[PDB]
Amino acid sequence: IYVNRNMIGAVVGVQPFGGNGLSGTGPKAGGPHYLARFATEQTVTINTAAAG
Amino acid sequence: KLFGSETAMPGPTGESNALTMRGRGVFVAISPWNFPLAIFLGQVTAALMAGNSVVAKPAEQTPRIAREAVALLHEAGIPKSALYLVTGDGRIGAALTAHPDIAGVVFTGSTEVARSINRALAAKDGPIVPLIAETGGINAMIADATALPEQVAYDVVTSAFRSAGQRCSALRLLFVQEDVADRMIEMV
Amino acid sequence: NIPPPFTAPYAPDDAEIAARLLPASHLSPPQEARIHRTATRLIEAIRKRLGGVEDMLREFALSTKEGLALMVLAEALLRVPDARTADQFIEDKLGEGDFIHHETKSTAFLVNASAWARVIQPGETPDGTIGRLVKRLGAPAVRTATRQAMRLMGNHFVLGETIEQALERGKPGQKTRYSFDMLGEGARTAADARRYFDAYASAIETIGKAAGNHALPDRPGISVKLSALHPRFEAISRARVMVELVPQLLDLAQRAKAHDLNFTVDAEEADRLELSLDVIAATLADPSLKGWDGFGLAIQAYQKRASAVIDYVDALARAHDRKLMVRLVKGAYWDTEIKRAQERGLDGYPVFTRKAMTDLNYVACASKLLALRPRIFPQFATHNALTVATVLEMAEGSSGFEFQRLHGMGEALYEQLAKDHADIAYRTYAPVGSHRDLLAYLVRRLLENGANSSFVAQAADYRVPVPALLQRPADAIVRPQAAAHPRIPLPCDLFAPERRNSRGVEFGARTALDQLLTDVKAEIADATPDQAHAAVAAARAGFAGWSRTPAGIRAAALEQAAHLLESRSAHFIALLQREGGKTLDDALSELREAADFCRYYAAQGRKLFGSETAMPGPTGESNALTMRGRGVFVAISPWNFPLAIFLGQVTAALMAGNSVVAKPAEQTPRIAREAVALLHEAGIPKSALYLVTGDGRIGAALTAHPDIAGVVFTGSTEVARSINRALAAKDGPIVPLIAETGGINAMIADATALPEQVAYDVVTSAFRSAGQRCSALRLLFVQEDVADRMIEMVAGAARELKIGDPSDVATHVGPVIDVEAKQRLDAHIARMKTEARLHFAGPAPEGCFVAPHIFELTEAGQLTEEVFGPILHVVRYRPENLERVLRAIERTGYGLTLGVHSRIDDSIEAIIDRVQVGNIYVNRNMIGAVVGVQPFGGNGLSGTGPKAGGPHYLARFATEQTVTINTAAAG
Amino acid sequence: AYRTYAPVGSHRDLLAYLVRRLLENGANSSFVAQAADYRVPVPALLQRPADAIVRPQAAAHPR
């Protein structure tokens, strides 16, 4: 949403760009939720008691 | 920030728990003609950064800028084995996305093509992979009678006609209050 | 009158205890002056300075793991028939290479003597515990440390391949100079419990033939552990324990009595205290033990119940008119007790959390025991010079008690005491047993010697001034309110201040278990396709308002749901047992997890949706990023966690600002309905949450509905694909699909792994909840050198599982969900019987039950399907072929959980680097993922992500919005 | 080839010599002191001096 200015030229890291509905899936390019979608999470759980 | 170090999780004594994020596999990156360098590079560098190798098919109208961007990434330190450029039509794009070994698709282009990519992915008996699709818009602007007509006109002309309107963000539909309608339209 | 079954409050307040112990600890200045002098002299003797384990750890700056590795290597090297062969190995081979091979072979030697009996290429990358040690210290120092470990293993331990070999080795017409601390503990199989019984019986005869001609207490003793004598020694199996174990313990007591020996029942974990006292009381009660003063037990001063145990033992002694020998110790399982109370969400710790509190309680308990002479003969087991000096002073004169130490500890301490006070008696114990029981004993011992708080460790460190060792415990505590350790939170505060932790129950406390069993015992038409469509439309109408309800109010609603869940835990636990067929621990755990989901998503919800994120940019412009609800989410949940996964998915979607239409598994709609009613009562509007029950056709109507904004799904891989296809066929928006599906989960156990622990964790991972967990172990890979022992131990342990009615507290394995499931399982069993070796097939009760089964495959590729039941598959492998194991795990295409059991960090790390599995568990079981601790969920055929119970979950239920305002006209 | 020296002299000259010698053996920076301390990993003793300084402006001791 752009208020009292034009609607174009989204700046990377300033206006994370991208929409919903028929406009896209997300996440927004140039924003902080983008990179995670390209990755998978991994939890490593180690029982450390024999060491202290 | 995201992949540079693990996130420690709180838990009981005598046990460690760490959350990490790793690459998924092979990403297919499909880019449009209207931002042939920046969207091409945005999608590709994101996938690479996340630890994925990338097969990139640029829009048929703009392969040369894509080839140069690819060579530039290789020279910037991206291994030849991590990044490949495949040029061609939509059937080639369909070949890459229907390939059973890829780990995800990042797509920017038409809504119709995104749906067919999504259908080709879902048809596979393999893993359900991520689809990142940024498609079009029918973008509105609402201008009320408190708005400055000289500024509305300028921002409307810019939003609609910059780049011959060949931007996904471009203004397509202007709503203007009737009391100021004649003046604003005439000025645009 | 015989005392009632022991029941003391499990974890009372530390401060109230300190308020009584602090003043009673007061001693007159001449009393303190005498203690100070005796202790100074004992400590100075210790600092005179071959020594002990603490010295080896200190001298080479060894971790506990490294000490363990060298002692194991040392023991193998000592049992080579020709000592010159050992010398050649140490100089030529050790430190030059084959580091992992040496670590693996010497550890395997302990269960498989034949395994241990190449040419080492130069420039080998130093990996493994020994390799890393060599890199840090250098090969020659490692050789020097190994020889020292050889002296320690040879001098301070009585060991053999069998008990007869150990007993022969430790032989003195002389009397034995030491009593026997028998190695065994925690039998996993019936065969193990008999072997330990036999070893105890053999030891009693060996020690009896060399017991000398004096009267008690001047005769040797033997220490015995109840967990070694019974393979399911636990409160829930009490009925069978009283019936099977008591006669065994009695048999041994009688054999000890016939040689007039000291016979001591060791004290183990806090959750076994009450059960051990029941066993000991019933055993002591037997008339055959009259006329003998050598029977006794250990009492741990680190426990708040310690004083009450002393009263109980004394009343037991008077009721039966016996004399007892009672060992007072501090306690060997402190770290274990902390960990457990935390995992189990107990309301406090059974032990003190400041070391000085244990020291105080020890002296108070000793004072109490001294006053119970001569009926009770106290034995003060400690290597603390100050504790010895203080107990000696309190005795004011002496006799009617003794001190106790472990061979290889407190030698100089007790020699000096005997010089300075000739009528002081002290008993010395030597560890005696088989190599197969060494590892478990060594680990515990190395934790005490390596501990920074250890008195023995400090007295040997010349950086620690003698006067620091003499600080009186009361002066360390100073004030009652400081009794609890400031840096150790109560389990309820484990996640503070981020969120509250759910409450658990300690089954080892009979008051708590009986109350829980009592409370629990005291406690649906389908939908038409039209009804499901109306539910969607209704949820669609409720979306606008709910999405705009402030995040803190949505969060308050989840938190109230958690509170109502815990307040009504008995009600929901009853439902989990009746509808889900879950055993009590599984039901309780599911209830905790459900509450945990509500609190964690609430807390992550405020963080993520509580306020906008400001984005940096030019002046004269603001840029704010927000996350809003998507629309109507369809939540489809499975039968195996019918409350927690159902609630996790639903409360997540709700928290993100979505309205929800929820379709629960056909087998478990009732718990779902109650959960829904509960969320509504917690503050979730009727218009935001709807329950639609029915089959997959109803589930399919919901997912094909053109107006929904997303699907969250947990279930079968095939159903997830058909949902994905139904969504992708739509001409509408591409909506998010979150799908957590199955796994074919592997465990890799190498020859450095402890078989008793592997067996326990394998049996748990594969057979808990009748294998009806998505994280369950299906495929065990075990190195060939330890395969026979490991498989045998797993099979023997599986046989001890009680299969039956999940409402009986003694049951370990309940029924499978329905006949359709049982049938599918039985077909796979019939197939595997014709296809693979059957190692174990248990006896199912009549009804919808499948018993644990263990099959060995020739290759992993013979297991091609997730089999959703208590059915373990085993593949043995050669150490050089680890890649083929890893390749076989990749081949399935699944990636949910993976277990790794190994001592070797480089091996563990290589496995982690290689595999893509969502949850890797190292040296523990693979189940019971805790919300916010183990973000759970996999990749490949196992799921889409993001992980449930983790920090990337909520975002996916939302969509982002950037608002960009040109602010220049304001300034 | 390596030459080995032994300290030779009268008791009346020992104290002054001993003080200086004990300052070198007791110094935390001493290589001999570190190589004898098993807490110090062999690789730490092998850090190249140029890698400790890294940059000219860091030549002087900051403290």
Ligand SMILES: Cc1cc2nc3c(=O)[nH]c(=O)nc-3n(C[C@H](O)[C@H](O)[C@H](O)COP(=O)(O)OP(=O)(O)OC[C@H]3O[C@@H](n4cnc5c(N)ncnc54)[C@H](O)[C@@H]3O)c2cc1C
């Ligand atoms: C012959 C013999 C038999 C034994 N049998 C048993 C047995 O059957 N069962 C058993 O549990 N123990 C038993 N022990 C005791 C155990 O093995 C340790 O030796 C003992 O706890 C050490 O106490 P201490 O006076 O030697 O040493 P210290 O260094 O004085 O005391 C150490 C002890 O303090 C306690 N401690 C450490 N940190 C904390 C803390 N933060 N808060 C509260 N307390 C803390 C622990 O119990 C620890 O062991 C036995 C010991 C001997 C010598």
Ligand SMILES: Cc1cc2nc3c(=O)[nH]c(=O)nc-3n(C[C@H](O)[C@H](O)[C@H](O)COP(=O)(O)OP(=O)(O)OC[C@H]3O[C@@H](n4cnc5c(N)ncnc54)[C@H](O)[C@@H]3O)c2cc1C
């Ligand atoms: C046979 C023999 C004869 C010697 N004769 C003399 C002599 O005639 N005159 C003399 O001055 N020395 C003399 N020395 C050297 C002195 O006695 C020390 O032995 C020597 O400096 C140690 O250096 P290193 O390579 O052994 O040890 P290292 O542990 O490598 O180096 C220690 C040296 O580093 C230097 N150093 C320590 N801290 C700092 C710092 N913050 N900044 C800069 N430098 C620092 C000091 O010089 C210190 O001695 C002699 C040594 C030997 C073996």
